[PDB]
Amino acid sequence: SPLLHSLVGQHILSVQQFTKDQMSHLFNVAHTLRMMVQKERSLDILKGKVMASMFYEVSTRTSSSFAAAMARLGGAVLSFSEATSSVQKGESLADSVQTMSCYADVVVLRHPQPGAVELAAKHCRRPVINAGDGVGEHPTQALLDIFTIREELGTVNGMTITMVGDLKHGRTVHSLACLLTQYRVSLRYVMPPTVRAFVASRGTKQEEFESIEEALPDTDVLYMTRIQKERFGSTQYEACFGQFILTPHIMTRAKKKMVVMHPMPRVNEISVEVDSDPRAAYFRQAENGMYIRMALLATVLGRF
Amino acid sequence: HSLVGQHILSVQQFTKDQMSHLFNVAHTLRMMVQKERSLDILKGKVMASMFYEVSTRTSSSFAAAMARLGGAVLSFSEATSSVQKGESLADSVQTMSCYADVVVLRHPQPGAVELAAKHCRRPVINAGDGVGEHPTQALLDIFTIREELGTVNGMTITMVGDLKHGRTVHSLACLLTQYRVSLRYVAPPSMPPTVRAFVASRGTKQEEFESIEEALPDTDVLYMTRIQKERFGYEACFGQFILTPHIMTRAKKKMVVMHPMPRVNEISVESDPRAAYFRQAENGMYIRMALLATVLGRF
Amino acid sequence: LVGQHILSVQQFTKDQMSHLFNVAHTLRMMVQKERSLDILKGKVMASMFYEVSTRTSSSFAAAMARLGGAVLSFSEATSSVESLADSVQTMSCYADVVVLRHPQPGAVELAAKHCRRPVINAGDGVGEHPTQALLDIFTIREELGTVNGMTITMVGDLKHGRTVHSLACLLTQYRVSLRYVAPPSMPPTVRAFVASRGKQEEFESIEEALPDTDVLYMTRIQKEREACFGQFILTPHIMTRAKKKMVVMHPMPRVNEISVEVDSDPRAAYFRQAENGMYIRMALLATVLGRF
């Protein structure tokens, strides 16, 4: 908590704590860490430090990337399977989280419950990096979604952002959508009216649209999301199954200097034949997170 | 002083010259980490983790420990193992003995561990059995006791909670007999009067007490334990063998309270430099580094 | 093989395997003397197993960890389980190889098919298990001096047998007499090609087929379709009518087919078999990643 930019020791719990000078740095780290790997430069950076993974939701992208990330800088990772943990013996979450805070130097916690994370973070001898909460924050996702947006399109400022799919529940879209307000972008929606109020305050446009087929011609980023059939309209359900879907047939009325993103997981929303399409940056999105974590973990531990 | 290759199955096999060394290793390994010195000690060697009880303190520490000296660890999940195709425990344990250089096995069954250990091309470090030992726990409980209070000899030790089932308390309570300490016991009428014949034989004083509120004024270590109201057949049993921060005011100031963990409602959460149960957990990691490293000949 | 997928045993040559073996010994002997192996330092392996195992994956884990690499513990149970490809490719973002094991007919071929990164089979529904077959050879070669000339008694339930179709076929790169021991219930499907390249004969039990046996390859049965269980069993009492210059193997797991008191027997190479896989993976992984 000193001069220059530095998170050294800082917890990483909400996206509110990031600045633009920090993120650009945070991005400048990732490219540099990436490029070391691309050429095979030794990374004894977090050699000897340890990361404690704690995930109570079901994931295999955040955690994996986090695992690859830690393992790439030289560090090690504590598999924590709650299923096979002393929780099957009645122990507090803090009790565990702190216990693990004894054997590790950072923490990566992911909990669905409303703010089980804030709590566990609150008192911790060691730092905690959010990966999910019940309140919907996901700074690492939001964080990585930017590099994609910046890398993919040259700059961030000016872009118009079509966020598509079920957004109400959407816990990733509150993380990015809000943070996007550090840039000059027009937000389109295809959403929780409660925290839509913070965004529009700072002038960040906000307009609702019928489907992709209409909102797409002025689109610089097509941010997609899993819907969930179960929990939809009611009897009727049908077209909204098909509308908020990106087939390769839709993608023909889409800008050519544009990129479509997905946090993932997905199922049938983005048509499998949309895989092989340069404008398809949803898989590279997954790849680039690994470097935010290396960009983050490494910094959050003072080794960069 | 050397266990190189030795199995680590019961607490009976430790000497005082060994443990002091075993402790002198831990501090030295600790202090390397505190400064950030490279530890290519068990670089290359591999540890095979095999746990059939539900834990996340012994195994984790063990994981951190191995990972810190440079080694790697085999995540062995029986759930996803050929057990679901159904093969012998030895079969597996030996199989894993093909891919690793040590082993850390934890089994509830009476002497599933002794067996698996018995025949093994590679060494096995106990972490729990049915019959009913836990040398690494006992081992680490000492450094806490020694580190926390200056010396081990002279201390009076209040072990509180359900002790009958207690598989950690038979590991330390016995071993404590290598020192000059007065053992006190606090239990719901329901310590196993089987293993107890051995400790008091050697004059390691042993006396029963009503609760903490009586046995605490002459207490150097308050060793706490999870009850298990799953054999109550008694909310005084609940609330008596409990350490609130309000009880802690009639407790010595040159004293420390320990817990192997896990816990639930027995110790009030609540900001007491006398609270060495979390640092207890931290200090195990270094027994394992102190042990694993030695048990593998790299120190 | 640099970049090559490893999906069926059809893609191996004898000059490749012998190299593939010459690597394993060399990698082994570095470990025996404790030589540093920064070989796959910085690369990452993504483990993806949908069957229940703890020998292939472990060996694979030890193997990767020994050359300096790291391993992605992928537990489908705690995973987004989205498409299998979706995942397999996703993991292909975070790793440099892949070790996939799927029971389904050709879930593996598929996932492999499109992958930015290489995939090393460990099991499929078609029954192909190149790493096992691969391994089973070094044992056969190491244990008996050479591979050519040996007569191979494969015993147990062979019909379902997914490991025996990996080795039995590949064995055809050598001059060996294949013998078979089964409960009347080997699949006469792949056998269209085994005897094409030239010996195969059926036998009543071990007690008859054993006197001209150089390798006694054993297998878990399936009480699920008695003498058919005690016959195709190797007690220590049977082992006395068995050649002295001969070795008995098992892919494992086992239960009661090989009598526990057959463990401590210098003709017993089924445990060393397990040990020697670790080095095919180091022999393979390392090569498959261009660091050797």
XYZ file of N, CA and C in Angstrom, chain A residues 91-254:
492
model
N -16.620 -28.216 10.243
C -15.660 -27.151 10.501
C -16.104 -25.871 9.825
N -15.810 -24.714 10.439
C -16.128 -23.427 9.819
C -15.394 -23.252 8.483
N -16.005 -22.476 7.592
C -15.367 -22.124 6.329
C -14.141 -21.272 6.613
N -14.300 -20.284 7.485
C -13.157 -19.466 7.918
C -12.087 -20.370 8.505
N -12.522 -21.237 9.410
C -11.650 -22.213 10.076
C -10.746 -22.868 9.028
N -11.362 -23.320 7.941
C -10.639 -23.990 6.858
C -9.792 -22.983 6.110
N -10.444 -21.905 5.692
C -9.797 -20.894 4.830
C -8.558 -20.342 5.524
N -8.687 -20.083 6.815
C -7.559 -19.655 7.634
C -6.540 -20.774 7.821
N -7.042 -21.986 8.031
C -6.184 -23.160 8.177
C -5.284 -23.279 6.960
N -5.904 -23.220 5.791
C -5.190 -23.220 4.517
C -4.298 -22.000 4.374
N -4.725 -20.889 4.968
C -3.881 -19.678 5.052
C -2.585 -19.896 5.843
N -2.523 -20.997 6.582
C -1.313 -21.382 7.308
C -0.290 -22.068 6.413
N -0.779 -22.774 5.393
C 0.047 -23.630 4.487
C 0.351 -23.044 3.103
N -0.188 -21.854 2.833
C -0.088 -21.209 1.536
C 0.261 -19.734 1.686
N 0.490 -19.071 0.553
C 0.802 -17.625 0.524
C -0.215 -16.734 -0.193
N -1.089 -17.314 -1.003
C -2.270 -16.594 -1.505
C -3.479 -17.485 -1.296
N -4.622 -17.055 -1.819
C -5.828 -17.870 -1.822
C -6.725 -17.475 -2.994
N -7.386 -18.483 -3.533
C -8.312 -18.318 -4.624
C -9.586 -19.022 -4.215
N -10.546 -18.225 -3.804
C -11.752 -18.744 -3.219
C -12.886 -18.427 -4.135
N -13.807 -19.369 -4.236
C -15.012 -19.185 -5.009
C -16.178 -19.790 -4.271
N -17.141 -18.942 -3.907
C -18.300 -19.375 -3.125
C -19.583 -18.783 -3.711
N -20.677 -19.584 -3.818
C -21.928 -19.017 -4.307
C -22.615 -18.115 -3.288
N -22.554 -18.483 -2.012
C -23.344 -17.838 -0.934
C -23.150 -16.316 -0.884
N -24.195 -15.557 -0.454
C -24.023 -14.106 -0.463
C -22.893 -13.659 0.455
N -21.731 -13.512 -0.164
C -20.614 -12.865 0.477
C -19.919 -13.757 1.490
N -20.015 -15.087 1.359
C -19.184 -16.069 2.130
C -17.711 -15.746 1.921
N -17.438 -15.123 0.782
C -16.075 -14.770 0.361
C -15.556 -13.562 1.138
N -16.301 -12.466 1.072
C -15.987 -11.237 1.850
C -15.580 -11.585 3.264
N -16.365 -12.474 3.873
C -16.143 -12.941 5.245
C -14.776 -13.587 5.337
N -14.622 -14.693 4.633
C -13.397 -15.485 4.676
C -12.167 -14.637 4.390
N -12.321 -13.736 3.425
C -11.288 -12.768 3.081
C -10.997 -11.894 4.274
N -12.071 -11.341 4.839
C -12.013 -10.287 5.871
C -10.851 -10.499 6.849
N -10.917 -11.616 7.561
C -9.881 -12.030 8.466
C -9.146 -13.133 7.710
N -7.902 -12.847 7.338
C -7.048 -13.825 6.671
C -5.611 -13.318 6.764
N -4.705 -14.120 7.326
C -3.293 -13.692 7.438
C -2.669 -13.540 6.057
N -3.361 -14.072 5.049
C -2.874 -14.153 3.676
C -3.953 -13.651 2.735
N -3.562 -13.231 1.521
C -4.469 -12.505 0.646
C -5.401 -13.434 -0.077
N -6.555 -12.903 -0.449
C -7.588 -13.708 -1.097
C -7.979 -13.056 -2.413
N -7.970 -13.851 -3.479
C -8.345 -13.395 -4.806
C -9.674 -14.001 -5.176
N -10.683 -13.156 -5.275
C -12.026 -13.628 -5.616
C -11.992 -14.434 -6.914
N -12.956 -15.327 -7.041
C -13.243 -15.972 -8.318
C -14.731 -16.103 -8.581
N -15.518 -15.702 -7.599
C -16.959 -15.782 -7.672
C -17.533 -15.601 -6.283
N -18.680 -14.949 -6.235
C -19.446 -14.785 -5.019
C -20.926 -14.897 -5.382
N -21.812 -14.772 -4.401
C -23.262 -14.699 -4.668
C -23.771 -13.331 -5.065
N -22.983 -12.303 -4.765
C -23.331 -10.911 -5.080
C -23.014 -10.656 -6.592
N -22.206 -11.534 -7.212
C -21.941 -11.524 -8.661
C -20.606 -10.996 -9.121
N -19.716 -10.604 -8.200
C -18.433 -10.016 -8.619
C -17.515 -11.114 -9.144
N -16.631 -10.741 -10.055
C -15.689 -11.683 -10.657
C -14.538 -10.912 -11.310
N -13.709 -10.280 -10.497
C -12.743 -9.314 -11.017
C -11.777 -9.868 -12.055
N -11.356 -11.108 -11.859
C -10.390 -11.787 -12.743
C -10.985 -12.007 -14.136
N -12.262 -12.391 -14.175
C -13.023 -12.497 -15.424
C -13.090 -11.142 -16.112
N -13.595 -10.149 -15.385
C -13.723 -8.788 -15.932
C -12.365 -8.344 -16.405
N -11.381 -8.575 -15.551
C -10.002 -8.201 -15.838
C -9.501 -8.748 -17.169
N -9.744 -10.040 -17.374
C -9.294 -10.759 -18.584
C -10.124 -10.432 -19.802
N -11.407 -10.181 -19.582
C -12.282 -9.845 -20.679
C -11.760 -8.594 -21.349
N -11.156 -7.680 -20.589
C -10.554 -6.474 -21.179
C -9.381 -6.774 -22.130
N -8.364 -7.478 -21.663
C -7.205 -7.733 -22.507
C -7.664 -8.277 -23.852
N -8.659 -9.166 -23.813
C -9.258 -9.714 -25.017
C -9.770 -8.561 -25.865
N -10.524 -7.675 -25.225
C -11.172 -6.537 -25.892
C -10.145 -5.576 -26.446
N -9.085 -5.384 -25.682
C -8.005 -4.470 -26.054
C -7.104 -5.116 -27.125
N -6.701 -6.360 -26.862
C -5.824 -7.117 -27.769
C -6.483 -7.346 -29.103
N -7.745 -7.730 -29.030
C -8.483 -8.170 -30.197
C -8.779 -7.042 -31.167
N -9.035 -5.837 -30.638
C -9.564 -4.715 -31.441
C -8.667 -3.482 -31.505
N -7.500 -3.551 -30.871
C -6.509 -2.469 -30.940
C -6.565 -1.516 -29.765
N -7.764 -1.039 -29.442
C -7.996 -0.231 -28.248
C -9.317 -0.630 -27.584
N -9.586 -0.057 -26.413
C -10.824 -0.346 -25.661
C -11.842 0.763 -25.872
N -11.337 1.989 -25.828
C -12.152 3.193 -25.981
C -12.732 3.289 -27.386
N -14.036 3.531 -27.437
C -14.778 3.720 -28.683
C -15.678 2.536 -28.974
N -15.313 1.366 -28.445
C -16.004 0.109 -28.795
C -17.432 0.127 -28.288
N -18.307 -0.521 -29.037
C -19.692 -0.713 -28.645
C -19.817 -2.177 -28.285
N -20.484 -2.464 -27.174
C -20.416 -3.794 -26.577
C -21.797 -4.423 -26.453
N -22.052 -5.393 -27.323
C -23.298 -6.155 -27.297
C -23.159 -7.327 -26.335
N -23.758 -7.177 -25.163
C -23.834 -8.269 -24.225
C -25.148 -8.970 -24.445
N -25.058 -10.255 -24.782
C -26.211 -11.071 -25.168
C -26.407 -12.227 -24.229
N -27.675 -12.526 -23.966
C -28.091 -13.753 -23.268
C -28.817 -13.424 -21.985
N -28.930 -14.406 -21.103
C -29.580 -14.181 -19.827
C -28.574 -13.408 -19.009
N -28.932 -12.162 -18.700
C -28.070 -11.217 -17.986
C -28.494 -10.981 -16.556
N -29.782 -11.208 -16.256
C -30.348 -11.023 -14.892
C -29.489 -11.720 -13.828
N -29.449 -13.042 -13.920
C -28.624 -13.873 -13.056
C -27.147 -13.557 -13.276
N -26.798 -13.295 -14.533
C -25.419 -13.061 -14.990
C -24.483 -12.440 -13.980
N -23.590 -13.258 -13.433
C -22.646 -12.816 -12.391
C -21.284 -12.345 -12.963
N -21.017 -12.675 -14.218
C -19.817 -12.208 -14.943
C -20.028 -10.814 -15.566
N -21.260 -10.550 -16.000
C -21.612 -9.333 -16.737
C -21.669 -8.118 -15.840
N -21.867 -8.327 -14.537
C -21.817 -7.182 -13.567
C -20.400 -6.785 -13.262
N -19.485 -7.722 -13.526
C -18.090 -7.539 -13.197
C -17.430 -6.710 -14.283
N -17.736 -7.048 -15.523
C -17.197 -6.342 -16.669
C -17.988 -5.096 -16.978
N -19.307 -5.237 -16.981
C -20.200 -4.153 -17.419
C -19.928 -2.883 -16.632
N -19.795 -3.049 -15.330
C -19.479 -1.929 -14.433
C -18.103 -1.354 -14.761
N -17.112 -2.236 -14.779
C -15.704 -1.863 -14.950
C -15.450 -1.210 -16.302
N -16.200 -1.652 -17.299
C -16.160 -1.033 -18.626
C -16.243 0.499 -18.554
N -16.885 0.999 -17.497
C -17.060 2.439 -17.260
C -15.736 3.206 -17.078
N -14.608 2.503 -17.058
C -13.293 3.149 -17.068
C -12.876 3.503 -18.504
N -13.756 3.238 -19.463
C -13.488 3.492 -20.881
C -14.651 4.257 -21.533
N -14.463 4.605 -22.801
C -15.484 5.278 -23.616
C -16.146 4.311 -24.559
N -17.178 3.640 -24.075
C -17.838 2.613 -24.864
C -19.347 2.745 -24.770
N -20.039 2.321 -25.821
C -21.500 2.310 -25.820
C -21.958 0.906 -25.520
N -22.641 0.745 -24.394
C -23.119 -0.573 -23.958
C -24.483 -0.855 -24.515
N -24.616 -2.026 -25.112
C -25.906 -2.498 -25.588
C -26.232 -3.753 -24.853
N -27.520 -4.015 -24.728
C -27.989 -5.155 -23.967
C -28.952 -6.021 -24.762
N -28.760 -7.340 -24.701
C -29.658 -8.283 -25.393
C -30.106 -9.489 -24.531
N -31.421 -7.652 -18.016
C -30.316 -7.167 -17.205
C -30.828 -6.647 -15.836
N -30.048 -6.841 -14.755
C -30.473 -6.379 -13.429
C -30.583 -4.854 -13.382
N -31.829 -4.320 -13.456
C -32.091 -2.862 -13.374
C -31.595 -2.110 -12.121
N -30.956 -2.817 -11.194
C -30.634 -2.267 -9.882
C -29.276 -1.602 -9.991
N -28.281 -2.390 -10.384
C -26.904 -1.954 -10.692
C -26.659 -1.493 -12.181
N -27.680 -1.557 -13.050
C -27.692 -0.738 -14.289
C -27.632 0.775 -14.005
N -28.036 1.163 -12.802
C -28.074 2.574 -12.361
C -26.702 3.233 -12.136
N -25.741 2.454 -11.647
C -24.364 2.931 -11.476
C -23.664 3.217 -12.803
N -23.940 2.391 -13.801
C -23.302 2.536 -15.124
C -23.714 3.816 -15.854
N -25.015 4.012 -15.978
C -25.552 5.160 -16.711
C -25.206 6.496 -16.067
N -24.855 6.477 -14.779
C -24.478 7.702 -14.045
C -23.303 8.407 -14.724
N -22.284 7.607 -15.048
C -21.066 8.063 -15.742
C -21.223 8.187 -17.279
N -22.458 8.148 -17.767
C -22.780 8.415 -19.178
C -22.634 7.228 -20.123
N -22.123 6.106 -19.619
C -21.893 4.913 -20.451
C -23.228 4.405 -21.011
N -23.487 4.736 -22.289
C -24.770 4.466 -23.009
C -25.363 3.142 -22.567
N -26.653 2.960 -22.782
C -27.286 1.708 -22.335
C -28.556 1.629 -23.089
N -28.639 0.716 -24.046
C -29.867 0.588 -24.816
C -30.219 -0.865 -24.974
N -31.508 -1.151 -24.845
C -32.016 -2.510 -24.967
C -32.325 -2.812 -26.425
N -32.192 -4.081 -26.785
C -32.421 -4.520 -28.161
C -33.250 -5.809 -28.231
N -33.894 -6.015 -29.386
C -34.818 -7.157 -29.624
C -34.109 -8.517 -29.692
N -32.939 -8.510 -30.315
C -32.146 -9.712 -30.553
C -30.766 -9.277 -31.093
N -29.950 -10.243 -31.516
C -28.608 -9.948 -32.080
C -28.773 -9.375 -33.487
N -29.675 -9.984 -34.241
C -29.975 -9.645 -35.647
C -30.205 -8.135 -35.902
N -30.584 -7.416 -34.854
C -30.766 -5.969 -34.928
C -29.593 -5.179 -34.333
N -29.122 -5.598 -33.163
C -28.094 -4.859 -32.408
C -26.683 -5.055 -32.927
N -26.504 -5.971 -33.857
C -25.172 -6.381 -34.308
C -24.378 -5.417 -35.251
N -25.061 -4.639 -36.121
C -24.332 -3.818 -37.127
C -23.420 -2.725 -36.557
N -23.669 -2.314 -35.315
C -22.866 -1.310 -34.604
C -22.118 -1.915 -33.422
N -21.726 -3.176 -33.579
C -21.176 -3.977 -32.510
C -19.657 -4.175 -32.679
N -18.889 -3.774 -31.675
C -17.448 -4.082 -31.641
C -17.089 -5.304 -30.794
N -17.908 -5.602 -29.795
C -17.754 -6.848 -29.031
C -19.109 -7.501 -28.773
N -19.213 -8.762 -29.167
C -20.428 -9.511 -28.946
C -20.202 -10.451 -27.788
N -20.525 -9.970 -26.601
C -20.322 -10.741 -25.392
C -21.537 -11.651 -25.155
N -21.308 -12.961 -25.152
C -22.380 -13.960 -25.146
C -22.503 -14.570 -23.753
N -23.669 -15.140 -23.438
C -23.912 -15.783 -22.120
C -24.887 -16.967 -22.132
N -24.603 -17.948 -21.279
C -25.458 -19.115 -21.103
C -26.775 -18.645 -20.524
N -27.869 -19.190 -21.060
C -29.219 -18.760 -20.685
C -29.727 -19.591 -19.502
N -29.864 -20.892 -19.782
C -30.593 -21.867 -18.958
C -32.023 -21.970 -19.494
N -32.329 -23.109 -20.105
C -33.662 -23.368 -20.652
C -34.595 -23.368 -19.472
N -34.396 -24.341 -18.586
C -35.059 -24.354 -17.298
C -34.775 -23.002 -16.630
N -35.870 -22.333 -16.254
C -35.968 -20.999 -15.609
C -36.433 -19.895 -16.571
N -36.877 -20.275 -17.778
C -37.199 -19.332 -18.869
C -38.645 -18.819 -18.762
N -39.109 -18.119 -19.800
C -40.516 -17.699 -19.937
C -41.580 -18.544 -19.242
N -41.963 -19.672 -19.876
C -43.010 -20.613 -19.370
C -43.388 -21.802 -20.340
N -44.546 -21.716 -20.999
C -44.988 -22.665 -22.027
C -44.451 -22.319 -23.410
N -44.301 -21.024 -23.714
C -44.332 -20.587 -25.090
C -43.126 -20.893 -25.941
N -40.669 -19.259 -24.247
C -39.561 -20.221 -24.221
C -38.933 -20.435 -25.603
N -39.742 -20.926 -26.523
C -39.275 -21.298 -27.880
C -38.248 -20.334 -28.554
N -38.699 -19.250 -29.176
C -37.811 -18.458 -30.057
C -36.586 -17.925 -29.309
N -36.792 -17.471 -28.075
C -35.683 -16.989 -27.217
C -34.606 -18.071 -26.972
N -35.002 -19.337 -27.101
C -34.032 -20.429 -27.267
C -33.182 -20.136 -28.506
N -33.826 -19.843 -29.640
C -33.144 -19.631 -30.932
C -32.598 -18.233 -31.262
N -33.138 -17.213 -30.600
C -32.843 -15.815 -30.951
C -31.477 -15.410 -30.413
N -31.325 -15.533 -29.093
C -30.061 -15.204 -28.394
C -29.031 -16.316 -28.612
N -28.857 -16.656 -29.886
C -27.955 -17.703 -30.352
C -27.206 -17.105 -31.519
N -25.917 -17.400 -31.589
C -25.087 -16.956 -32.687
C -24.726 -18.177 -33.548
N -25.514 -18.397 -34.602
C -25.139 -19.341 -35.649
C -24.106 -18.654 -36.551
N -23.371 -19.425 -37.386
C -22.535 -18.757 -38.411
C -23.328 -18.030 -39.492
N -24.637 -18.289 -39.570
C -25.546 -17.615 -40.507
C -25.914 -16.219 -40.056
N -25.982 -16.025 -38.746
C -26.194 -14.691 -38.176
C -24.937 -13.877 -38.404
N -23.782 -14.469 -38.082
C -22.471 -13.765 -38.131
C -22.113 -13.068 -39.463
N -22.930 -13.253 -40.504
C -22.731 -12.605 -41.810
C -23.204 -11.153 -41.892
N -24.111 -10.757 -40.993
C -24.566 -9.362 -40.850
C -23.802 -8.639 -39.728
N -22.737 -9.275 -39.260
C -21.898 -8.763 -38.189
C -20.661 -8.086 -38.772
